[PDB]
Write a protein that binds this ligand. Structure first.
Ligand SMILES: CCCCCCCCCCCCCCCCCC(=O)OC[C@H](CO[C@@H]1O[C@H](CO[C@H]2O[C@H](CO)[C@H](O)[C@H](O)[C@H]2O)[C@H](O)[C@H](O)[C@H]1O)OC(=O)CCCCCCCCCCCCCCCCC
Ligand SMILES: CCCCCCCCCCCCCCCCCC(=O)OC[C@H](CO[C@@H]1O[C@H](CO[C@H]2O[C@H](CO)[C@H](O)[C@H](O)[C@H]2O)[C@H](O)[C@H](O)[C@H]1O)OC(=O)CCCCCCCCCCCCCCCCC
Ligand SMILES: CCCCCCCCCCCCCCCCCC(=O)OC[C@H](CO[C@@H]1O[C@H](CO[C@H]2O[C@H](CO)[C@H](O)[C@H](O)[C@H]2O)[C@H](O)[C@H](O)[C@H]1O)OC(=O)CCCCCCCCCCCCCCCCC
Ligand code: CLA
Ligand code: CLA
Ligand code: CLA
Ligand SMILES: CC(C)=CCC/C(C)=C/CC/C(C)=C/CC/C(C)=C/CC/C(C)=C/CC/C(C)=C/CC/C(C)=C/CC/C(C)=C/CC/C(C)=C/CC1=CC(=O)C(C)=C(C)C1=O
Ligand SMILES: CCCCCCCCCCCCCCCCCC(=O)OC[C@H](CO[C@@H]1O[C@H](CO)[C@H](O)[C@H](O)[C@H]1O)OC(=O)CCCCCCCCCCCCCCCCC
Ligand SMILES: CCCCCCCCCCCCCCCC(=O)OC[C@H](CO[C@@H]1O[C@H](CS(=O)(=O)O)[C@@H](O)[C@H](O)[C@H]1O)OC(=O)CCCCCCCCCCCCCCC
Ligand code: HEC
Ligand code: OEX
Ligand SMILES: [Cl-]
Ligand SMILES: [Cl-]
Ligand SMILES: [Fe+2]
Lengths: 244, 137, 334, 200, 101, 170, 30, 32, 97, 33
């Protein structure tokens, strides 16, 4: 219902997206002469999976489950952007703004910790063509940017960084700089991710939708110092569409 | 070194007229600056927006310019943004906004010049320290 | 008689090798929990994100530390002052990450050490003694509450409590100097006089009693066998020590009452240490050390630096480097 | 007993005046330490937003939001070191709070000038300062003569509370010793320990 | 290059002119830097020893000879034979003095 | 503070022995004064107990036997020999200052215990390896660069703003 | 190997505590 | 961790040798 | 093969002039009348091909177009550097006093 | 030579520990008479 901050605080519910009834399986019509926007988009991860490093013999690497260790701090919400109607009839969402990143650390068997910037920054998600109405079989597929996990000012434990910091290993004054370059030289990565959103609950009266999502993106590489992992994120999402 | 009239001579207006000050007025305007302004402007910086300081060079490139007494006294009545396009007395203390910034209610016109001359004098004394921040403490 | 009383008599028994007592009933299990968690974490705890910025600090021997660099690491700033028992975590893995062992250890320890204090009273009552030893111990106890409890409260986070480590302790001291100028605080000056003066009077009292030992042995045996335990008489001539020390200085700077002399030895370091713990506890609320930066100026207004200004340059270098990735805005207000 | 009671109460008083801005209004007593630390983040969200920053999507250096992040139960809270202080509640700030914490739409649209003023006033009056009443951090230059009443009252009442707890232990133990009849020392003729079996 | 004093485990790279006016450095914060080698186009030419007559002009190379110029004259070292770790040690003059004092 | 930022004097075993000798002296000072004061024999009928001691008396003014038992049972050990106990009091602090004096003679030569090599070799290769050891070194670097120009005027250190080391914001 | 050495020495000290308390020279009263 | 490998033998003898000295002297006191 | 991209940028025109595509918004204080009003506009519309495309920003008053003309000699443009513009770093680059 | 580094700790302990044992028992044998 109309709960309040003081109802919610400390419960873990601030990290949950809203939901629609078992019975909201209707459909929202798209008046192509019209303009639209996602007034709020919320993504809530429920599982993080990391691809394992198959040995030189390999055969195949699988996505293994991982333990979340950073608590109910993982959700993306208050995301806004405009829902265009294209000419083949498809719908395309274009993010503007929103809390569209969360840093997250999960932990693999054996104890390896894997940070990642769970994000949909600059998302661009489209429907199949000729969608006159949004329904409980509508899908968007999209891509986003994943900037470096740390940004340019971040200094390492020996004081080294990109936009700031030592440019060398000062505790070893006369070592050979050559084998240290990958840690002396901070690099700022920007990669692309992918996300599918499967609408499964629609409430045409209010303009709300709800469904599942699954994304794949890279984990932190620590400004160039090691190789990233592939990560697969699944969860649920909630959206509100308003006439623009 | 000592506090002299050549030190205490600061631009009065942008017409290059000047005015010379007393020991009494510089010290008078130090006290009032402490009372009314330094909570934010200690040593020539601005705590709530460190990008703007009171270095006379910064004051020079303000629209209107503020590296003189009249410009400063005006800013203390009707403050604007650096570029002149916005009045900001709703958030910056001023005589205009002395109903929300009480410490201004009892400032006389002789007081606002005391403060302005202090501001314009102080960097002749301290140089880089004034407006510099912790690097120069 | 009945069960509850046979047990009550065992608890308060003065014949147990180690006194238990009612304070001992709370003390034992809590020290045991603190000690066991601490030994396991020091050795094996994985890295701990102390400042809430997902930048874990390794404190344990198996993760690359030695005795001097290791520590049990304070819980995360993201927790601040919230209670974080194991049961509040979704997994031991989360708990370890966010620094839970630190909270478990310091509460069981603070509790068990406060009952240590009461135990000192309790056994003195069963033994017919005067009761105030526990008062002396309150000076170290109070100092421990300061760095582990009071200072986190005032600053809003157990992430700023003292780490459980040799190097971590230095880390805490240096950041304290930059943020409070503790060296310029009178209560810590009272603490140094506390412990310099204690060690002084320690070396003095020993040196002067050892100087006045009564020949009871030959040159081939330890002097120590000139004393036998529970002997009725004294083993040194205090009149002789007064005569020596009364002349080292002058006659009335010298104690000749044994009772006055020992109460002096108790009171000096206890009070001083009370003051330095009071000083950590009031700098918990940002009532900081004297500030004479740019306090001396010349006729014109130039700053004439003093030694206080040099101290501030040191303080400033600690200020700007500490927790280097943790500040987004220009003041470090806690 | 009363020394014990009063000790407990000075400690509570200490914590009342440091954290509580209801019966200790900040209009009268200056901001609380959390209040000042929170007000600093608000200040620089406002300014940067005025310049054009999208404060909800600004990744800071660590990967955490420069301006906004989640607490450990998910609530949206101010970023930076003030994350420890998200429990703060004050009339100048509660307006911008929705069900899941701070509302980004209200941040974008509803920040009144009186809040910009309160927030700046409070961050420049944070309860930090020196014993000779130079106000600010320890590295601050002389100029501003200020130590918050919250510091003066909480420090002074901790000191008092602590020394009254020491009072308790002194007089409680003496009162037991005296009622047993050995407050003046051990009776040489009846030294209890002598009637005790050895520990080994 | 201003030379490292004995007190300092570490020392910044600061280049002055014959008078001492700072003219180039390697900055920590890059954002408002005004003296970087890139900005000043500083170069290293060598005279004597292995490098005699050589000149380097790209900043990364000029930067690493700049970090050794704080130590004085620049020598080729063999660090593989002894598995040297790159951290300075004292001489027997030092070890004798310490032992006897 | 100079000794922290240039010599890393806190990390030095000889200062650690001195620190243990001073705080240990203060400990023995306090705990022996309180034990004597709280095992005294009743030798007058007044509440001020000080007036019940004559410097010329033969008798011990407090009970070594009962003190011993208290501490055996509180702490597990106690002193039993009054000569050993007072010699140990001369010993502990006196030996502490001597050990600290040795470390300073090393610092006369800049023979510091400034680093742990193994930590530096790892930290240099592994940018996620952080310990309290490395945090403290960053603080030292700050102390050195911020205080030296003014601490050592005769050197004419000029550090442009842009070479001064600083974390974010501060 | 270094961790093992630190822990072994620590372990020996705990053992020494045990004997020093429970197997002390028992003090007696001549 | 790339530690000094004579550290083990140095710690070991630093413990062993003076400890053997004390044990030798305690046991031969107890048997007279 | 491995270079600090920010250090490379200081050898470009970013190191001499206000880079309309990269420089932090506080650098516009250096010159009269740009800050804050036009700084916001320059940055909000940032990515430009040539320094003079900045006169085509929608809404400029005629005094605004003239101020910019006066200060075109103090501008340059280079390629957008990802590390310089992400994190909202153009609005706040972590530098205060 | 590229030799086993525990060889040294091994030899030292192999020698020291049985030796100290024999010495400890010898010296307390002499302390009896
Ligand atoms: C005999 C009795 C024996 C009983 C022992 C067993 C009981 C355990 C008690 C544990 C106390 C330690 C934890 C206190 C930490 C803490 O957060 O304590 C502070 C709390 C106040 O809590 C704060 O309270 C705040 C309330 O303010 C909120 O509400 C306010 C209302 O205006 C504002 O709006 C504010 O913004 C808003 O946040 C928030 O909830 C904070 O998050 C929360 O930390 O005080 C308290 O509950 C008040 C009590 C103060 C604790 C007293 C400290 C005693 C010091 C020991 C001294 C040792 C002496 C030497 C020994 C020798
Ligand atoms: C044996 C052991 C020895 C160690 C003992 C330790 C105690 C000795 C050290 C303390 C005594 C020396 C203090 C002398 C300092 C001085 O002259 O003191 C001067 C200071 C005031 O200093 C002035 O303070 C000024 C404050 O300025 C501020 O205020 C000004 C207006 O006042 C301006 O506005 C200015 O801009 C603004 O910044 C400036 O800093 C001046 O330069 C500065 O001179 O006194 C104050 O603050 C006033 C309050 C005095 C508190 C100090 C006494 C505390 C003693 C506690 C110890 C005894 C307790 C035992 C219990 C029994
Ligand atoms: C030998 C052994 C060593 C010891 C030797 C003894 C050396 C010291 C002896 C101490 C002598 C005490 C008098 C010191 C003079 C003093 O104080 O003089 C200072 C002031 C009078 O000076 C005025 O002090 C003011 C202090 O500022 C106050 O006023 C300002 C202006 O309105 C602002 O409001 C500011 O915020 C507020 O703090 C300003 O600096 C004025 O300019 C100045 O005129 O006296 C006061 O306040 C009077 C003090 C009243 C008692 C206050 C009790 C405080 C309770 C805190 C207890 C916790 C303490 C913890 C400490 C650790
Ligand atoms: C010569 C220089 C010097 C000297 C003499 C001192 C002296 C002191 N300083 Mg200062 N300090 C200095 C320089 C100096 N400092 C510098 C340069 C800085 C700035 C970097 C600081 C920063 C600083 C801080 C920040 C703090 C000190 C504190 C102290 C005090 C520490 C002792 C203490 O708390 O005992 C008190 C006793 C204890 C702490 C012990 C508690 C014992 C518990 C109850 C039992 C533990 C038992 C154990 C776990 C198990 C043992 C069992 C075993 C037998 C098996 C003392 C008065 C501290 C202080 O005042 O604390 C209140 C403090 O917090 N100093
Ligand atoms: C030198 C000694 C000293 C001094 C000057 C102070 C000074 C102060 N103390 Mg402290 N205090 C001290 C020692 C001291 N304290 C000691 C030793 C302790 C024990 C550890 C405490 C514990 C303590 C507590 C627990 C608290 C204070 C507080 C305070 C402040 C408010 C006092 C007050 O109003 O009391 C109250 C006054 C009385 C009890 C007298 C009764 C008055 C009647 C009931 C009032 C009725 C009023 C009513 C509205 C009128 C209605 C009229 C009509 C409409 C019907 C004040 C600045 C308060 C504070 O600010 O803490 C931060 C507080 O809460 N004190
Ligand atoms: C617990 C009660 C309490 C509290 C919180 C305060 C707090 C304050 N008083 Mg008040 N005051 C008190 C009791 C109290 N005082 C008493 C009992 C008296 C009469 C002696 C005064 C007389 C008084 C005057 C006359 C003045 C103040 C002023 C002030 C302010 C400046 C204090 C200062 O600079 O101290 C400086 C610090 C010290 C002198 C150190 C004191 C520490 C002692 C010596 C050690 C602790 C002793 C004990 C063991 C604990 C501050 C708001 C001033 C102000 O601004 O008024 C408008 C002012 O001029 N007070
Ligand atoms: C691997 C893992 C798990 C480890 C955990 C890591 C951890 C952090 C451990 C690291 C520990 C570490 C390295 C230790 C450092 C210690 C270090 C600095 C060593 C100092 C060495 C030393 C040689 C220094 C030189 C100076 C020196 C001699 C100091 C000695 C100090 C000393 C022992 C003082 C005595 C302390 C004390 C508790 C005494 C109790 C006395 C007592 C029983 C009094 C009782 C008593 C009183 C009376 O009055 C009467 C009358 C009677 C009758 C009576 O009984
Ligand atoms: C016989 C009993 C054995 C006693 C226990 C032995 C341990 C004692 C302590 C050993 C010294 C610590 C060295 C660590 C091991 C190390 O690597 O050493 C090894 C180093 C030699 O160094 C080795 O050298 C090799 C090439 O020769 C390689 O460089 C190796 O890397 C390097 O380890 O040993 C020493 O340097 C010799 C020790 C003699 C030092 C005398 C100068 C110091 C005199 C100061 C005395 C003041 C004392 C103050 C007292 C108060
Ligand atoms: C104008 C400003 C306002 C004025 C303010 C005044 C404040 C002053 C308070 C006066 C305090 C009263 C004296 C103390 C009580 C007393 O005398 O103790 C009891 C005994 C009695 O003396 C003994 O007296 C005995 C007789 S009797 O007991 O007094 O009756 C006698 O037998 C014996 O020989 C003799 O030594 O005193 C001592 O034994 C002598 C040494 C006293 C040392 C002072 C006590 C506390 C020291 C702590 C210092 C902390 C320093 C911190 C370091 C970091
Ligand atoms: C904090 C609440 C402040 C107080 C108190 C005072 N000023 Fe201020 N000042 C503040 C800000 C945030 C700004 C920037 C305004 C903007 O353009 O956004 C300023 C600016 C000034 C200036 C302009 C300086 C320049 O570089 O152009 C001046 C001359 C100035 N302030 C003076 C001043 C005086 C004299 C005050 C006391 C009477 C005073 N300010 C109070 C914040 C705050
Ligand atoms: O965490 Mn630990 O340290 Ca007390 O200030 Mn703010 O916070 Mn952080 O900074 Mn400086
Ligand atoms: Cl730090
Ligand atoms: Cl911050
Ligand atoms: Fe004694």
């Amino acid at each position: 219902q109309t709960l309040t901050y003081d109802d919610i605080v400390g419960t873990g519910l601030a990290n949950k997206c809203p939901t629609l009834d078992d019975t909201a399986r209707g459909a929202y019509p798209i008046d192509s002469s019209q303009t639209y926007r996602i007034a709020r988009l919320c993504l809530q991860p429920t599982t993080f999976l990391v691809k394992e490093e198959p040995k030189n013999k390999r055969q195949e690497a699988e996505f293994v489950p991982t333990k979340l260790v950073t608590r109910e701090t993982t959700s993306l919400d208050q995301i806004q952007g405009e829902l265009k109607v294209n000419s083949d009839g498809s719908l395309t969402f274009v993010e503007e703004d929103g809390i569209d990143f969360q840093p997250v650390t999960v932990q693999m068997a054996g104890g390896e910790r894997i940070p990642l910037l769970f994000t949909v920054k600059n998302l661009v998600a489209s429907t199949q063509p000729n969608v006159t109405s949004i329904t409980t079989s509508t899908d968007f597929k999209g891509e986003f940017n994943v900037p470096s996990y740390r940004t340019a000012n971040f200094l390492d434990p020996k004081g080294r960084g990109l936009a700031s910091g030592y440019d060398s290993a000062i505790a070893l004054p006369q070592a050979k700089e050559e084998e240290l370059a990958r840690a002396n030289v901070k690099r700022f990565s920007l990669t692309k991710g992918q996300i599918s959103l499967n609408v499964a609950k629609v409430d045409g009266r209010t303009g709300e939708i709800a469904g599942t999502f699954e994304s794949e993106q890279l984990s932190d590489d620590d400004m160039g110092a090691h190789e990233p992992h592939e990560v697969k994120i699944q969860g649920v999402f909630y959206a509100s569409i308003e006439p623009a | 070194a000592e506090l002299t009239p050549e030190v205490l001579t600061v631009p009065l207006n942008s017409e290059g007229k000047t005015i010379t000050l007393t020991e009494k007025q510089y010290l008078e305007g130090k006290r009032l600056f402490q009372y009314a302004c330094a909570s934010c402007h200690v040593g020539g910086i601005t705590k709530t927006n460190p990008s703007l300081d009171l270095r006379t060079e910064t004051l020079a490139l303000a629209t209107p310019p503020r590296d003189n007494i009249e410009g400063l006294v005006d800013y203390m009545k009707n403050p604007t943004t650096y570029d002149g396009e916005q009045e900001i007395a709703e958030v910056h203390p001023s005589l205009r906004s002395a109903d929300i910034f009480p410490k201004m209610r009892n400032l006389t016109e002789k007081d606002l010049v005391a403060i302005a001359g202090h501001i314009l004098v102080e960097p002749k004394i301290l140089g880089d320290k004034w407006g510099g921040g912790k690097v120069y403490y | 008689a009945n069960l509850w009383e046979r047990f009550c008599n065992w608890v308060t028994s003065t014949d147990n090798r180690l006194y238990v007592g009612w304070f001992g009933v709370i003390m034992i299990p809590t020290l045991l929990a603190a000690t066991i968690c601490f030994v396991i974490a020091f050795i094996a705890a994985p890295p701990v994100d102390i400042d809430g910025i997902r930048e874990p600090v390794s404190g344990s021997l198996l993760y690359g530390n030695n005795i001097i660099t290791g520590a049990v690491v304070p819980s995360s700033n993201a927790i601040g002052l919230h209670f974080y028992p194991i049961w509040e975590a979704a997994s031991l893995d989360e708990w370890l990450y966010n620094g839970g062992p630190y909270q478990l250890i310091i509460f069981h320890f603070l509790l068990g050490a406060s009952c240590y204090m009461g135990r000192q009273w309790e056994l003195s009552y069963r033994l017919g003694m005067r009761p105030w030893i526990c008062v002396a111990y309150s000076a170290p106890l109070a100092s421990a509450f300061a760095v582990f409890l009071i200072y986190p409260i005032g600053q809003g986070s157990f992430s700023d409590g003292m780490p459980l480590g040799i190097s971590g302790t230095f880390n805490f001291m240096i950041v304290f100097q930059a943020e409070h100028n503790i060296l310029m605080h009178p209560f810590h000056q009272l603490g140094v006089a506390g412990v310099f003066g204690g060690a002084l009077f320690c070396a003095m009292h020993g040196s002067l009693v050892t100087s006045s030992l009564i020949r009871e042995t030959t040159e081939t045996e330890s002097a120590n066998y000139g004393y036998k335990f529970g002997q009725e008489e004294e083993t040194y001539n205090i009149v002789a020590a007064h005569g020596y020390f009364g002349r080292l200085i002058f006659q009335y700077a010298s104690f000749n009452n044994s009772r006055s002399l020992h109460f002096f030895l108790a009171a000096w370091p206890v009070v001083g240490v009370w003051f330095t713990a009071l000083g950590i506890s009031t700098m918990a609320f940002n009532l900081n050390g004297f500030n004479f930066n740019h306090s001396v100026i010349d006729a014109k207004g130039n700053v004439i630096n003093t030694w206080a200004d040099i101290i501030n340059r040191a303080n400033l270098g600690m200020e700007v480097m500490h927790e280097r990735n943790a500040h987004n805005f220009p003041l470090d207000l806690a | 007993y009363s020394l014990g009671a009063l000790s407990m109460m000075g400690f509570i008083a200490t914590c009342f005046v440091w954290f509580n801005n209801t019966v200790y209004p900040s209009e009268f007593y200056g901001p609380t330490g959390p209040e000042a630390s929170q007000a600093q983040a608000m200040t620089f969200l406002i300014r940067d937003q005025k310049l054009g920053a999208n404060v909800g999507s600004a990744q800071g250096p660590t990967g955490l939001g420069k301006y906004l992040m989640r607490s450990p139960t998910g609530e949206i809270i101010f970023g930076g070191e003030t994350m420890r202080f998200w429990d703060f509640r004050g009339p100048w700030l509660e307006p911008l709070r929705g069900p899941n914490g701070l509302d980004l739409n209200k941040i974008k649209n509803d920040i009144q000038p009186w809040q910009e003023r309160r927030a700046a006033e409070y961050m420049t009056h944070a309860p930090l300062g020196s014993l000779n009443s130079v106000g600010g951090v320890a590295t601050e230059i002389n100029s501003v003569n200020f130590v918050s009443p919250r510091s003066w009252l909480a420090t002074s009442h901790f000191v008092l509370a602590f020394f009254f707890l020491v009072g308790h232990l002194w007089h409680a133990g003496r009162a037991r010793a005296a009622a047993a009849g050995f407050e003046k020392g051990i009776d040489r003729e009846s030294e209890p320990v002598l009637s005790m079996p050895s520990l080994d | 290059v201003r030379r490292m004093p004995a007190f300092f485990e570490s020392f910044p790279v600061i280049l002055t002119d014959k008078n001492g006016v700072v003219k180039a450095d390697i900055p920590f914060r890059r954002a408002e830097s005004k003296y970087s080698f890139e900005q000043q186009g500083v170069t290293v030419s060598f005279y004597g020893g292995e490098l005699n007559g050589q000149t380097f002009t790209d900043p990364p190379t000029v930067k690493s000879y700049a970090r050794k110029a704080i130590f004085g004259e620049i020598f080729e070292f063999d660090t593989e034979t002894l598995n040297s770790d790159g951290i300075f040690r004292t001489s027997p003059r030092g070890w004798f003095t310490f032992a006897h004092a | 503070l100079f000794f922290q930022g240039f010599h890393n004097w806190t990390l030095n075993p000889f200062h650690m022995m001195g620190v243990a000798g001073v705080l240990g002296g203060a400990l023995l000072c306090a705990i022996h004064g309180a034990t004597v004061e709280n095992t005294l024999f009743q030798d007058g009928e007044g509440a001020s107990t000080f007036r019940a001691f004559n410097p010329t008396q033969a008798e011990e003014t407090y009970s070594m036997v009962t003190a011993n038992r208290f501490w055996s049972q509180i702490f597990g050990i106690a002193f039993s020999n009054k000569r050993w106990l007072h010699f140990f009091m001369l010993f502990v602090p006196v030996t502490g200052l001597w050990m600290s004096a040795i470390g300073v003679v090393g610092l006369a030569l800049n023979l510091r215990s400034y680093d742990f090599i193994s930590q530096e070799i790892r930290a240099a290769e592994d940018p996620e390896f952080e310990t309290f050891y490395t945090k403290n070194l960053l603080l030292n670097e700050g102390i050195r660069a911020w205080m030296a120009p003014q601490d050592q005027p005769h050197e004419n250190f000029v550090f442009p703003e842009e070479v001064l080391p600083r974390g974010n914001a501060l | 190997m270094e961790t093992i050495t630190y822990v072994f020495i620590f372990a020996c000290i705990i053992a020494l505590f045990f004997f020093a308390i429970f197997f002390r020279e028992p003090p007696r009263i001549t | 961790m790339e530690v000094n490998q004579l550290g083990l033998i140095a710690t070991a003898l630093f413990v062993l040798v003076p400890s053997v000295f004390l044990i030798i002297l305690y046991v031969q006191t107890e048997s007279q | 093969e491995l270079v600090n991209v920010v250090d490379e940028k200081l050898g470009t025109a970013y190191g001499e002039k206000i880079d309309l595509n990269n420089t932090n918004i506080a650098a516009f204080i250096q010159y009269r009348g740009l800050y804050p009003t036009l700084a916001k506009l320059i940055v909000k519309n940032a990515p430009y091909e040539s320094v003079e495309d900045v006169l085509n920003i929608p809404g400029l008053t005629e005094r605004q177009k003239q101020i910019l003309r006066e200060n075109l000699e103090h501008f340059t443009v280079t390629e957008v550097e990802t590390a310089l513009v992400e994190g909202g770093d153009r609005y706040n680059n972590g530098l205060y006093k």
